[PDB]
Amino acid sequence: SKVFIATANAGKAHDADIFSVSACNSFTVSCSGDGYLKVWDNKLLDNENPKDKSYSHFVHKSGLHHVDVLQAIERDAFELCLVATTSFSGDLLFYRITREDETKKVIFEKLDLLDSDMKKHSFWALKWGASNDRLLSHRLVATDVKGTTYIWKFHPFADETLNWSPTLELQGTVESPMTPSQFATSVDISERGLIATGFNNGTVQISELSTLRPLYNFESQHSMINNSNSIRSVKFSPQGSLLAIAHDSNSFGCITLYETEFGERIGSLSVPTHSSQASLGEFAHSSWVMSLSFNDSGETLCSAGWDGKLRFWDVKTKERITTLNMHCDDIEIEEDILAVDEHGDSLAEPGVFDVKFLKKGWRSGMGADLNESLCCVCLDRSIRWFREAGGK
Amino acid sequence: IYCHYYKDHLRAFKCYFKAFDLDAGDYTAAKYITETYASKPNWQAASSIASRLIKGEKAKAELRSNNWPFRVVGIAHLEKQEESDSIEWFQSALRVDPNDVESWVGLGQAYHACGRIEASIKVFDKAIQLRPSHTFAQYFKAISLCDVGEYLESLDILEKVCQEAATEESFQIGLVEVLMRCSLDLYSQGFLLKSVSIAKDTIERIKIIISELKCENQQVWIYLSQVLRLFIWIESKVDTLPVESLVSIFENSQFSGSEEIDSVDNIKIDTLLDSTTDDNVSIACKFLILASKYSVSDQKFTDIAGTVRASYWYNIGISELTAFITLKEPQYRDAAIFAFKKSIQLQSNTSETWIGLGIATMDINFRVSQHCFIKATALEPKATNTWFNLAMLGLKKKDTEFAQQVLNKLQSLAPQDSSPWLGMALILEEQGDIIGSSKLFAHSFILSNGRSKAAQFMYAKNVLENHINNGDDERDIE
């Protein structure tokens, strides 16, 4: 089941570029440069416009370039849903999401969890660490422009009978190994308790989430021109010890696979791309790889490139399974098709800002085999949802 | 009466046996006799009683409820190592009592003997599903899982078992097996560093087997032999090699010793570590040999037709040969030839020994080496290694055309291998058509996917030799 087919579209979802997208069992949340967080109901019924079940809420004037949501069922009784976001200002915003009593409409409650000394930091990337027995308490990782990784523990309850009062305890930091310190461009945390921190100099550092200890760091090759290579996205494999690193080689995107036991390079994903007119080159994407995502099984790796192509690779064979070409006119609503942008540039083949795999059951669909799903946001201010044609 | 009231086993058995012969349609007698013989154990009889009962069809009503005849015939067929026949019986037994655990286990075990491996996985999975307190079902499932290639699950299973019943041998040996298979697999797939870790782990386990149980299988020493190669092959972490653990592993096990073999290589547990100023690699080699050599034709072992002796001397030959190639010291060559000679006489039909003999004879005199390689090609026609080694000899004696011919033959045979392409390249770099040679080194590397040292090395070298002074500009992406 590696053939994806589109299910629902929302064109002109925002008034400025949508940079990050995330989702959970309840909904898919997308943030953009208009500083509006947008909650999109995942549970839809046949032929219903996602925008009818979209709830939007302001956050920051500057805009938001990173969002992640954590949905857990904390106590056997209580349901916890929490959105975290970073703004272009660098501010780290937190919003509790809940639904109305009968209307089932979304309600945002901005939570204030950081102290004044911490708020002074200019955060960039973030990731929520669910309570997966790593330790018992939900954790949050973030990165600042100075190249440091912040690790908090999130306690939603007061000293353990149960009442709502959230607190983020700073467990600590992981400083970059290099000097001068480099810009920490993205981050991710594994199921087995490992943090990966990706800098803009092709360097990646692997550290322990529990013990805040750095384990090692590796670099990406071809360093002829310094400003060329930088890491766009890093993502751990759920199944194995594998780690996929998405980096630039100036004007081209590269996916390299490292295994995390000893931290060695095990392979690289590429396909015939364009180089020197007639000649053929070996890169992942003809343009920069913007974001990665693994399917639940860990067998497929979807990569969203700036070339407006979503490419799904098979992790085991390291060859490409399939490719999806994004178009401005994929959108089911004509009036929401964004052919040209503000400056009259063409968005016929809009680069993919971000992509995400949705677990089976999150996206509810009528008369379809209950299966995995996919979601991505693209430069034409458009958010698309696909389903993995398969069975269960 | 005798069975329940007088408590006379012999007379009762005799009676029921006398009864069945006349009736053949009384469940009770068949059951008593079968049960008696099942405990003996003599399944060839129980299979007869049971089969007779089933075929009789005079107890069709009784057998609709109790499944033991079917099972019995099945098990009897299992212990005759005719597993394929066993299936229809077990499958039929379970149709009656689908909760019969041992019959599931048997069934899966029969599947596994017919390379229905994933099905085996599922069967054993159900077996555990019923009785999760089952260790053997877990063992079998672990092995099948390993065979399909899922090492993680297999290992979690086997470790979880080995903890629970560390007294038993099969489980431990299984752990070793799955571990070393993991090692070789991860080595082969490119996970070089992790392979060593799994190797250290598995050698530690082997030490634990020899120390804890003093359990000597033919297999453990082969396992160790196969594991040790990794330290030899990948020198980067050769220092990980645990000398102490090995010394213990060898000191604990008792080997009668072979003076004829020991006298050639000059290697004994007391002698080899005595040497000074020898690299960890050589130490590893010596341990490899010692291990391969220490493998036991244990007491009470029944070697069918004596193939095992040939496999023993063969393995020794390969080990010695590895040591020779690694260290370039004649003793290991002489020992290798000697061993292969010893093995050949015992068997004389296996292609794979002649190969080693041929390799071991390339330097001394080509005629015999060739002869060996040719015999090998004849003994296993589907073997691609033989031809290649022969071609390499062809190069060794500086016969370009021949080597090229053989290599073309290989391209015809198996074009997926990097080796033939690499050889064809080398010939052409020696020949001087360097552009096509570069094309070939490239293709070879690409097919290699990082499998062979020589491919990577030669590729890099060629890339340099081409692009060092041909006037490339820093802008040219390619």
DSSP string, A128-169: EE--SSSSSSEEEEEEETTSEEEEEEEEEES-----EEEEEE
Distance CA(A7)–CA(A44), nearest Å, equals: 11
Considering only CB atoms, B193 lies closest to which of A262, A267, A281, namely A262
Chain A residues whose CB is inside 8 A of the B189 CB are 266
Domain range enclosing A157: 1-392
B477 touches chain A (CB under 8 A): yes
The torsion region of residue A239 among left (phi > 0), alpha (psi -120 to 50) and beta comes to: alpha
Residue B6 is given by DSSP the state I
Chain B residues whose CB is inside 8 A of the A281 CB are 477-478
User: Which of A363, A239, A254, A369 is closest to A294 using CA atoms?
Assistant: A239
Q: Do B191 and A264 touch (CB under 8 A)?
A: yes
Distance CA(A383)–CA(A338), nearest Å, equals: 12
Nearest residue of B to residue A265 by CA position? B191
Q: Do B194 and A261 touch (CB under 8 A)?
A: yes
Q: Which amino acid is at B238?
A: V
Distance CA(B140)–CA(B406), nearest Å, equals: 44
Whether the bond into B242 is cis, omega within 30 of 0: no
Q: Residue B83: phi, psi to the nearest 5?
A: -55, -40
User: Which of A330, A253, A287, A235 is closest to A11 using CA atoms?
Assistant: A330
Structure tokens at B343: 């093995």
Q: For chain A, where are the alpha helices, taking DSSP H only?
A: 116-119
Residue by residue, DSSP assigns B182-202 as: HHHHHHHHT-HHHHHHHHHHH
Instruction: With H, G, I as helix, E, B as strand and everything else as coil, classify residue A170.
Output: strand
Distance CA(B369)–CA(B354), nearest Å, equals: 9
Q: Do B197 and A275 touch (CB under 8 A)?
A: no
Residue with tokens 């020198």: B235
Residue by residue, DSSP assigns A343-390 as: TS-B-SS--EEEEEEEPTTTSB-TTS-S--EEEEEETTTEEEEEEEE-
Q: Do A224 and B192 touch (CB under 8 A)?
A: no
Distance from CA of A206 to the nearest CA of B (A): 16
Instruction: With H, G, I as helix, E, B as strand and everything else as coil, classify residue B377.
Output: helix
Distance CA(B268)–CA(B257), nearest Å, equals: 9
Residue A255, strand partner residues: A246, A269
User: Which of A367, A317, A276, A358 is closest to A40 using CA atoms?
Assistant: A358
Half-sphere exposure of B267 (CA within 13 A, CB side): 24
Q: For B97-191, where are the alpha helices, taking DSSP H only?
A: 101-112, 117-130, 135-148, 151-164, 169-189
CB A83 within 8 A of CB A64: no
CB A255 within 8 A of CB A300: no
Considering only CB atoms, A224 lies closest to which of B189, B191, B474, namely B474
Distance CA(B231)–CA(B280), nearest Å, equals: 9
CB A387 within 8 A of CB A57: no
Distance CA(A358)–CA(A254), nearest Å, equals: 24
Chain A residues whose CB is inside 8 A of the B478 CB are 275-276, 279, 281
Q: Do A275 and B478 touch (CB under 8 A)?
A: yes
Interface test with B, best of A192, A224, A266 (most B CBs within 10 A): A266
Whether the bond into A180 is cis, omega within 30 of 0: yes
Q: Do A276 and B194 touch (CB under 8 A)?
A: no
Helices (H) and strands (E) in chain B, counts: 24, 0
Chain B residues whose CB is inside 8 A of the A267 CB are 190
Half-sphere exposure of B85 (CA within 13 A, CB side): 12
Q: Which amino acid is at B473?
A: D
Considering only CB atoms, A262 lies closest to which of B189, B194, B474, namely B194
Cα B231–chain centre separation: 19
B197 touches chain A (CB under 8 A): yes
Q: Which long-range contacts (CB under 8 A, 24 or more apart) does B126-130 make?
A: B127/B101, B130/B99, B130/B101, B130/B104
Say how many residues make up chain B. 478
Distance CA(B75)–CA(B66), nearest Å, equals: 16
Convert B227-277 into a string of H (helix), E (strand) and C (coil). Answer: HHHHHHHCHHHHHHCCHHHHHHHHHHCCCCCCHHHHHHHCCCCCCHHHCCC
Q: Which long-range contacts (CB under 8 A, 24 or more apart) does B419-423 make?
A: B419/B388, B419/B444, B419/B452, B420/B388, B420/B391, B421/B447, B422/B448, B422/B452, B422/B454, B422/B455, B422/B458, B423/B388, B423/B391, B423/B392, B423/B395
Q: Which helix (H) or strand (E) holds A97?
A: strand A92-99
Number of structural domains, chain A?
1
Residue with tokens 């560390």: B166
Interface test with A, best of B152, B477, B478 (most A CBs within 10 A): B477
Structure tokens at B358: 């041929």
Chain A residues whose CB is inside 8 A of the B472 CB are none
Distance CA(B204)–CA(B226), nearest Å, equals: 14
Q: Do A262 and B477 touch (CB under 8 A)?
A: no
Nearest residue of B to residue A225 by CA position? B474
Distance CA(B55)–CA(A64), nearest Å, equals: 79
Distance CA(B273)–CA(B283), nearest Å, equals: 7
Compute the 3-state secondary structure of chain B and give helix, strand, coil in percent, each to the nearest 5: 75, 0, 25
B248 touches chain A (CB under 8 A): no
Nearest residue of B to residue A316 by CA position? B189
CB A258 within 8 A of CB A264: yes
Considering only CB atoms, B191 lies closest to which of A259, A275, A276, namely A259
Q: What is the CA radius of gyration of chain B?
A: 29
CB A377 within 8 A of CB A22: no
A262 touches chain B (CB under 8 A): yes
CB B211 within 8 A of CB B252: yes
Distance CA(B239)–CA(B394), nearest Å, equals: 37
Q: Do A261 and B477 touch (CB under 8 A)?
A: no
CB B178 within 8 A of CB B202: no
Chain B residues whose CB is inside 8 A of the A273 CB are none
**B278 CB neighbour count, 10 Å cutoff:** 14
Distance CA(A31)–CA(A126), nearest Å, equals: 13
Dihedral of the CA atoms A16, A20, A23, A29 (nearest 10)? -30
Q: Which amino acid is at B361?
A: T
Distance CA(A85)–CA(A82), nearest Å, equals: 10
Residue B334: partners with Cβ closer than 8 Å, 6 or more residues away:
B264
Structure tokens at B76: 């009897």
Q: Do A276 and B474 touch (CB under 8 A)?
A: no
Distance CA(B155)–CA(B141), nearest Å, equals: 11
B443 touches chain A (CB under 8 A): no
Burial of B267 (0-12, 13-18, 19+ CB in 10 A): buried
Residue with tokens 């959108």: A331
User: Which of A98, A93, A39 is closest to A65 using CA atoms?
Assistant: A93
B191 touches chain A (CB under 8 A): yes
Distance CA(B320)–CA(B264), nearest Å, equals: 10
CB B178 within 8 A of CB B154: yes
Residue with tokens 């069918």: B304
Q: Which long-range contacts (CB under 8 A, 24 or more apart) does A298-304 make?
A: A298/A237, A298/A238, A298/A239, A298/A240, A298/A242, A299/A239, A300/A2, A301/A244, A301/A255, A301/A269, A302/A355, A302/A357, A302/A374, A303/A246, A303/A253, A303/A255, A303/A269, A303/A355, A304/A352, A304/A353, A304/A354, A304/A355, A304/A376
Instruction: With H, G, I as helix, E, B as strand and everything else as coil, classify residue B329.
Output: coil
CB A207 within 8 A of CB A174: yes
Chain B residues whose CB is inside 8 A of the A279 CB are 478
Write b or e for each residue in A65-103: b if 16 or more Cβ atoms lie within 10 A of its Cβ, otherwise e: bbbbbbbbeeeeeeebbbbbbbbbebbbbbbbbebeeee
Task: Order across the sheet with A92-99: list the strands.
Answer: A64-72, A80-87, A92-99, A106-111
Instruction: With H, G, I as helix, E, B as strand and everything else as coil, classify residue B323.
Output: helix
Considering only CB atoms, B193 lies closest to which of A264, A267, A276, namely A264
A342 touches chain B (CB under 8 A): no
Q: What angle do CA A126, A130, A134 make, to 5 degrees?
A: 110
Q: What is the largest CA-CA distance in chain B?
A: 106
Q: What angle do CA A203, A209, A215 make, to 5 degrees?
A: 45
Residue with tokens 């490899």: B288
User: Which of B350, B265, B281, B278 is closest to B316 using CA atoms?
Assistant: B265
Q: Do A264 and B477 touch (CB under 8 A)?
A: no
User: Which of B381, A326, B411, A348 is closest to B391 using CA atoms?
Assistant: B411
Nearest residue of B to residue A251 by CA position? B477
Burial of B462 (0-12, 13-18, 19+ CB in 10 A): buried
Report the relative pairing of strands A309-314 and A203-208 from DSSP bridges. unpaired
Q: Do B191 and A266 touch (CB under 8 A)?
A: yes
Structure tokens at B17: 């046996």
Beta strands in A145-251 (DSSP E): 148-157, 164-175, 184-189, 194-199, 203-208, 214-219, 231-236, 242-249
Helices (H) and strands (E) in chain A, counts: 1, 30
Distance CA(B236)–CA(B150), nearest Å, equals: 27
Distance from CA of A200 to the nearest CA of B (A): 21
CB A259 within 8 A of CB A241: yes
User: Which of B293, B299, B300, B282 is closest to B338 using CA atoms?
Assistant: B293
Dihedral of the CA atoms A300, A304, A308, A311 (nearest 10)? -20
CB B70 within 8 A of CB B35: no
Chain A residues whose CB is inside 8 A of the B192 CB are 264
Q: Residue A151: phi, psi to the nearest 5?
A: -125, 110
Residue B40: partners with Cβ closer than 8 Å, 6 or more residues away:
none
Distance CA(B276)–CA(B267), nearest Å, equals: 14
Structure tokens at B102: 């041992």
Nearest residue of A to residue B189 by CA position? A266
Q: Which method was used?
A: X-ray
Instruction: With H, G, I as helix, E, B as strand and everything else as coil, classify residue B215.
Output: coil
Residue with tokens 């000893």: A262
Burial of B398 (0-12, 13-18, 19+ CB in 10 A): exposed
Chain A residues whose CB is inside 8 A of the B476 CB are 276
Distance CA(B345)–CA(B354), nearest Å, equals: 11
Chain B residues whose CB is inside 8 A of the A262 CB are 193-194, 197
Dihedral of the CA atoms B41, B44, B49, B51 (nearest 10)? 130
* Angle of the B280-294 helix axis to the B243-252 helix axis, nearest 10: 20
Q: Which helix (H) or strand (E) holds B372?
A: helix B366-379
B473 touches chain A (CB under 8 A): no
Considering only CB atoms, A279 lies closest to which of B191, B474, B478, namely B478
Q: Residue B451: phi, psi to the nearest 5?
A: -75, -45
CATH number of A4's domain: 2.130.10.10
Instruction: With H, G, I as helix, E, B as strand and everything else as coil, classify residue A62.
Output: coil
**A213 CB neighbour count, 10 Å cutoff:** 9
Residue B218: partners with Cβ closer than 8 Å, 6 or more residues away:
B295, B296, B297, B298, B301, B308
